[PDB]
């Protein structure tokens, strides 16, 4: 409880009960001083006035925030394998957040040498927003999470938010939040912080694929009792028309009737990895599917959940529909295709349409003796009453949850990037070094003190999540697909440290291996 | 007022007793009528409606296109297909992440 005692121990373990797994993980962090203890408004005009469609107005704060919204934070690649091989679905139940062993250090820079010294009485202050009053930025899949590998030290990202604007100019409804106006908990070295949170009931994620497609649900041995129109023209020549009907059955497979139809589609442009087959033009921004809001085009990144490469040709991928993860040590801009990791939707093509292809075809007119039948293409389709789909897959590098925007109505609020949508998600945890001012002038001055002490803090966090598992009941005879490591020899081990100490994840790992009947 | 036509693939077609497998005449089958449901539901063979395709101006006339297919909207109401004595009683809702109004 003092300077000499330790606030808490390092508890990192994953204990697997039959129905539930509890993942504890501990990291050590470093919190700098952001904006020199200032709130500041930012806009495009601060960066630059080049774009209208890219325009923003918001505030950057001295505060910083803990973000643990990716699975690699909470799961080792071995525990992820144990999860996705043995279980149909998993769901979070409870969450426990501890913050302990805080230590604050004054940096005294003498122009001869920069010196760092421990500051015993200094404070760091932490609050969780449990009323969801502040803007919730965690669901945006920003970088700055906990590191995957438990041995790394990570710097806490700076908190900031955007509000309404017209161009770079503010609107009367634009709200300014002072994070300092809140009941934070100040704590010094020798204090610990903790809180618990219970996830609201959500649906299990589906870690299973499907063992039969939606368009083959039938008995291949038996006919339907329903008829289709097989033939219209009765032969070559004039005035040959006969309505002829036929039982839909194994002979003609496609024309049968069905109780259910595949999910909606919003078509994507198809881009091939092999570069010679692509058109010689800049089609990236021009030829991309987008959605416009308030006269402002937001490119449609993963909006619907659709199969990617159809089948048998994996060479291409949907333009903006796929998830693209970067490999370890990857540049910011114009990185080659081999530097990133492109996600595959292959599993989900049983219930869902191919992203790059039209949903279907529809009659555009009425036929007559004089008029031929014309049919058009359905590029996008909304929900219909008989429509069925699945959600996008959950990668170990991807987001765990998202906050469902508070709104009058929403449909199937599953996050389009992935994970568990929640009305009230795990509350944001914000942290800041309490400012220590440099020596004030001896005569009183109205102006606020702009001179402070260079300072930062350290410590360890423990994030303990409890999960709920849905175990495999599968009755199939033959063996199942599982996630494995390639046995063949290599210079390095996948999901292991390098020679110079750099940890890396070779490829994305989805949850869908086990199969289930549709 | 015109029952002479029917939707191509949208209608249910039942066969009469002792009906062949293929290329049976129209009089051999029994074609189902949706007539009852036309109060809340649009005609299957006709477009849903019409929608503006551009902005008018002093220089430009207003153009409107046809809505061939329409998804659900927030103010939208319908009914389910009718239940015949020759038809299916129930169906299994496929086990999936999400589905809307899973009526067969």
GROMACS .gro file of N, CA and C in nm, chain B residues 9-82:
model
  222
  527UNK      N    1  -4.271  -1.738  -6.284
  527UNK     CA    2  -4.224  -1.831  -6.182
  527UNK      C    3  -4.279  -1.801  -6.043
  528UNK      N    4  -4.363  -1.701  -6.027
  528UNK     CA    5  -4.406  -1.661  -5.894
  528UNK      C    6  -4.525  -1.738  -5.840
  529UNK      N    7  -4.606  -1.793  -5.929
  529UNK     CA    8  -4.725  -1.866  -5.888
  529UNK      C    9  -4.689  -2.008  -5.845
  530UNK      N   10  -4.775  -2.065  -5.761
  530UNK     CA   11  -4.769  -2.207  -5.727
  530UNK      C   12  -4.853  -2.286  -5.826
  531UNK      N   13  -4.798  -2.396  -5.876
  531UNK     CA   14  -4.864  -2.477  -5.977
  531UNK      C   15  -4.879  -2.617  -5.920
  532UNK      N   16  -5.002  -2.659  -5.894
  532UNK     CA   17  -5.031  -2.794  -5.850
  532UNK      C   18  -5.081  -2.876  -5.968
  533UNK      N   19  -5.042  -3.003  -5.971
  533UNK     CA   20  -5.091  -3.093  -6.074
  533UNK      C   21  -5.221  -3.161  -6.034
  534UNK      N   22  -5.306  -3.185  -6.133
  534UNK     CA   23  -5.427  -3.262  -6.113
  534UNK      C   24  -5.393  -3.410  -6.100
  535UNK      N   25  -5.488  -3.486  -6.046
  535UNK     CA   26  -5.470  -3.630  -6.031
  535UNK      C   27  -5.437  -3.694  -6.165
  536UNK      N   28  -5.336  -3.780  -6.165
  536UNK     CA   29  -5.295  -3.850  -6.285
  536UNK      C   30  -5.238  -3.758  -6.391
  537UNK      N   31  -5.136  -3.681  -6.354
  537UNK     CA   32  -5.074  -3.584  -6.444
  537UNK      C   33  -4.931  -3.626  -6.474
  538UNK      N   34  -4.891  -3.610  -6.600
  538UNK     CA   35  -4.759  -3.652  -6.643
  538UNK      C   36  -4.648  -3.573  -6.578
  539UNK      N   37  -4.525  -3.616  -6.607
  539UNK     CA   38  -4.407  -3.553  -6.550
  539UNK      C   39  -4.366  -3.427  -6.625
  540UNK      N   40  -4.367  -3.430  -6.758
  540UNK     CA   41  -4.311  -3.322  -6.838
  540UNK      C   42  -4.409  -3.277  -6.945
  541UNK      N   43  -4.400  -3.148  -6.978
  541UNK     CA   44  -4.469  -3.089  -7.092
  541UNK      C   45  -4.619  -3.118  -7.089
  542UNK      N   46  -4.675  -3.117  -6.970
  542UNK     CA   47  -4.819  -3.134  -6.956
  542UNK      C   48  -4.888  -3.004  -6.993
  543UNK      N   49  -5.008  -3.017  -7.050
  543UNK     CA   50  -5.081  -2.900  -7.095
  543UNK      C   51  -5.126  -2.816  -6.976
  544UNK      N   52  -5.159  -2.689  -7.004
  544UNK     CA   53  -5.200  -2.597  -6.899
  544UNK      C   54  -5.323  -2.647  -6.824
  545UNK      N   55  -5.413  -2.718  -6.893
  545UNK     CA   56  -5.534  -2.768  -6.830
  545UNK      C   57  -5.509  -2.888  -6.739
  546UNK      N   58  -5.391  -2.949  -6.746
  546UNK     CA   59  -5.360  -3.062  -6.658
  546UNK      C   60  -5.320  -3.018  -6.518
  547UNK      N   61  -5.278  -2.893  -6.501
  547UNK     CA   62  -5.231  -2.846  -6.371
  547UNK      C   63  -5.334  -2.755  -6.307
  548UNK      N   64  -5.305  -2.709  -6.186
  548UNK     CA   65  -5.392  -2.619  -6.112
  548UNK      C   66  -5.309  -2.499  -6.071
  549UNK      N   67  -5.340  -2.383  -6.128
  549UNK     CA   68  -5.260  -2.263  -6.104
  549UNK      C   69  -5.321  -2.184  -5.989
  550UNK      N   70  -5.237  -2.147  -5.894
  550UNK     CA   71  -5.278  -2.076  -5.774
  550UNK      C   72  -5.294  -1.926  -5.800
  551UNK      N   73  -5.391  -1.866  -5.732
  551UNK     CA   74  -5.423  -1.725  -5.746
  551UNK      C   75  -5.389  -1.653  -5.616
  552UNK      N   76  -5.322  -1.539  -5.627
  552UNK     CA   77  -5.284  -1.454  -5.514
  552UNK      C   78  -5.386  -1.344  -5.486
  553UNK      N   79  -5.501  -1.348  -5.553
  553UNK     CA   80  -5.592  -1.233  -5.561
  553UNK      C   81  -5.618  -1.167  -5.426
  554UNK      N   82  -5.626  -1.247  -5.319
  554UNK     CA   83  -5.670  -1.193  -5.191
  554UNK      C   84  -5.576  -1.087  -5.137
  555UNK      N   85  -5.448  -1.097  -5.169
  555UNK     CA   86  -5.345  -1.033  -5.088
  555UNK      C   87  -5.308  -0.898  -5.148
  556UNK      N   88  -5.378  -0.858  -5.254
  556UNK     CA   89  -5.344  -0.738  -5.329
  556UNK      C   90  -5.373  -0.609  -5.253
  557UNK      N   91  -5.434  -0.616  -5.135
  557UNK     CA   92  -5.459  -0.494  -5.059
  557UNK      C   93  -5.329  -0.438  -5.001
  558UNK      N   94  -5.250  -0.521  -4.934
  558UNK     CA   95  -5.123  -0.478  -4.877
  558UNK      C   96  -5.003  -0.503  -4.967
  559UNK      N   97  -5.017  -0.582  -5.073
  559UNK     CA   98  -4.901  -0.626  -5.147
  559UNK      C   99  -4.908  -0.580  -5.292
  560UNK      N  100  -4.794  -0.550  -5.353
  560UNK     CA  101  -4.794  -0.506  -5.492
  560UNK      C  102  -4.814  -0.622  -5.587
  561UNK      N  103  -4.858  -0.588  -5.708
  561UNK     CA  104  -4.877  -0.689  -5.812
  561UNK      C  105  -4.741  -0.743  -5.854
  562UNK      N  106  -4.731  -0.876  -5.863
  562UNK     CA  107  -4.602  -0.939  -5.888
  562UNK      C  108  -4.547  -0.902  -6.025
  563UNK      N  109  -4.633  -0.888  -6.124
  563UNK     CA  110  -4.586  -0.867  -6.260
  563UNK      C  111  -4.556  -0.721  -6.291
  564UNK      N  112  -4.584  -0.629  -6.200
  564UNK     CA  113  -4.574  -0.487  -6.227
  564UNK      C  114  -4.468  -0.424  -6.137
  565UNK      N  115  -4.413  -0.312  -6.183
  565UNK     CA  116  -4.310  -0.242  -6.108
  565UNK      C  117  -4.365  -0.191  -5.975
  566UNK      N  118  -4.276  -0.177  -5.878
  566UNK     CA  119  -4.317  -0.133  -5.745
  566UNK      C  120  -4.367   0.010  -5.748
  567UNK      N  121  -4.305   0.094  -5.831
  567UNK     CA  122  -4.332   0.236  -5.825
  567UNK      C  123  -4.239   0.310  -5.918
  568UNK      N  124  -4.219   0.437  -5.888
  568UNK     CA  125  -4.141   0.525  -5.973
  568UNK      C  126  -4.063   0.619  -5.884
  569UNK      N  127  -3.946   0.663  -5.933
  569UNK     CA  128  -3.853   0.738  -5.850
  569UNK      C  129  -3.779   0.838  -5.938
  570UNK      N  130  -3.744   0.952  -5.879
  570UNK     CA  131  -3.673   1.056  -5.953
  570UNK      C  132  -3.528   1.016  -5.975
  571UNK      N  133  -3.482   1.029  -6.099
  571UNK     CA  134  -3.346   0.990  -6.136
  571UNK      C  135  -3.248   1.106  -6.144
  572UNK      N  136  -3.291   1.230  -6.125
  572UNK     CA  137  -3.199   1.342  -6.140
  572UNK      C  138  -3.252   1.460  -6.061
  573UNK      N  139  -3.184   1.574  -6.076
  573UNK     CA  140  -3.232   1.702  -6.027
  573UNK      C  141  -3.283   1.784  -6.145
  574UNK      N  142  -3.403   1.838  -6.132
  574UNK     CA  143  -3.452   1.932  -6.231
  574UNK      C  144  -3.378   2.064  -6.220
  575UNK      N  145  -3.386   2.142  -6.326
  575UNK     CA  146  -3.337   2.279  -6.326
  575UNK      C  147  -3.410   2.354  -6.435
  576UNK      N  148  -3.381   2.484  -6.446
  576UNK     CA  149  -3.437   2.560  -6.557
  576UNK      C  150  -3.396   2.499  -6.690
  577UNK      N  151  -3.273   2.448  -6.699
  577UNK     CA  152  -3.224   2.388  -6.821
  577UNK      C  153  -3.268   2.243  -6.838
  578UNK      N  154  -3.287   2.170  -6.728
  578UNK     CA  155  -3.305   2.026  -6.732
  578UNK      C  156  -3.446   1.987  -6.689
  579UNK      N  157  -3.510   1.903  -6.769
  579UNK     CA  158  -3.638   1.845  -6.732
  579UNK      C  159  -3.620   1.738  -6.625
  580UNK      N  160  -3.729   1.705  -6.558
  580UNK     CA  161  -3.729   1.598  -6.459
  580UNK      C  162  -3.742   1.463  -6.528
  581UNK      N  163  -3.650   1.372  -6.497
  581UNK     CA  164  -3.659   1.234  -6.542
  581UNK      C  165  -3.685   1.143  -6.422
  582UNK      N  166  -3.774   1.047  -6.441
  582UNK     CA  167  -3.806   0.947  -6.340
  582UNK      C  168  -3.791   0.809  -6.400
  583UNK      N  169  -3.735   0.717  -6.322
  583UNK     CA  170  -3.720   0.579  -6.361
  583UNK      C  171  -3.816   0.487  -6.287
  584UNK      N  172  -3.809   0.360  -6.324
  584UNK     CA  173  -3.896   0.259  -6.266
  584UNK      C  174  -3.822   0.179  -6.160
  585UNK      N  175  -3.891   0.147  -6.052
  585UNK     CA  176  -3.837   0.061  -5.948
  585UNK      C  177  -3.882  -0.081  -5.980
  586UNK      N  178  -3.788  -0.165  -6.022
  586UNK     CA  179  -3.824  -0.301  -6.057
  586UNK      C  180  -3.831  -0.389  -5.933
  587UNK      N  181  -3.734  -0.375  -5.844
  587UNK     CA  182  -3.733  -0.447  -5.718
  587UNK      C  183  -3.715  -0.348  -5.604
  588UNK      N  184  -3.769  -0.383  -5.488
  588UNK     CA  185  -3.762  -0.298  -5.372
  588UNK      C  186  -3.737  -0.384  -5.249
  589UNK      N  187  -3.647  -0.338  -5.163
  589UNK     CA  188  -3.625  -0.401  -5.035
  589UNK      C  189  -3.719  -0.347  -4.930
  590UNK      N  190  -3.698  -0.392  -4.807
  590UNK     CA  191  -3.778  -0.343  -4.696
  590UNK      C  192  -3.744  -0.198  -4.669
  591UNK      N  193  -3.844  -0.119  -4.632
  591UNK     CA  194  -3.822   0.015  -4.582
  591UNK      C  195  -3.879   0.020  -4.441
  592UNK      N  196  -3.859   0.127  -4.365
  592UNK     CA  197  -3.909   0.128  -4.227
  592UNK      C  198  -4.060   0.140  -4.216
  593UNK      N  199  -4.130   0.186  -4.318
  593UNK     CA  200  -4.273   0.202  -4.308
  593UNK      C  201  -4.354   0.097  -4.382
  594UNK      N  202  -4.293  -0.018  -4.406
  594UNK     CA  203  -4.342  -0.112  -4.505
  594UNK      C  204  -4.419  -0.225  -4.439
  595UNK      N  205  -4.528  -0.267  -4.502
  595UNK     CA  206  -4.620  -0.366  -4.447
  595UNK      C  207  -4.662  -0.461  -4.559
  596UNK      N  208  -4.682  -0.588  -4.526
  596UNK     CA  209  -4.715  -0.689  -4.626
  596UNK      C  210  -4.790  -0.803  -4.558
  597UNK      N  211  -4.818  -0.908  -4.635
  597UNK     CA  212  -4.866  -1.035  -4.581
  597UNK      C  213  -4.794  -1.152  -4.646
  598UNK      N  214  -4.803  -1.266  -4.577
  598UNK     CA  215  -4.742  -1.390  -4.620
  598UNK      C  216  -4.830  -1.462  -4.722
  599UNK      N  217  -4.766  -1.547  -4.802
  599UNK     CA  218  -4.837  -1.625  -4.902
  599UNK      C  219  -4.937  -1.720  -4.837
  600UNK      N  220  -5.046  -1.746  -4.908
  600UNK     CA  221  -5.159  -1.818  -4.854
  600UNK      C  222  -5.127  -1.966  -4.837
   0.00000   0.00000   0.00000
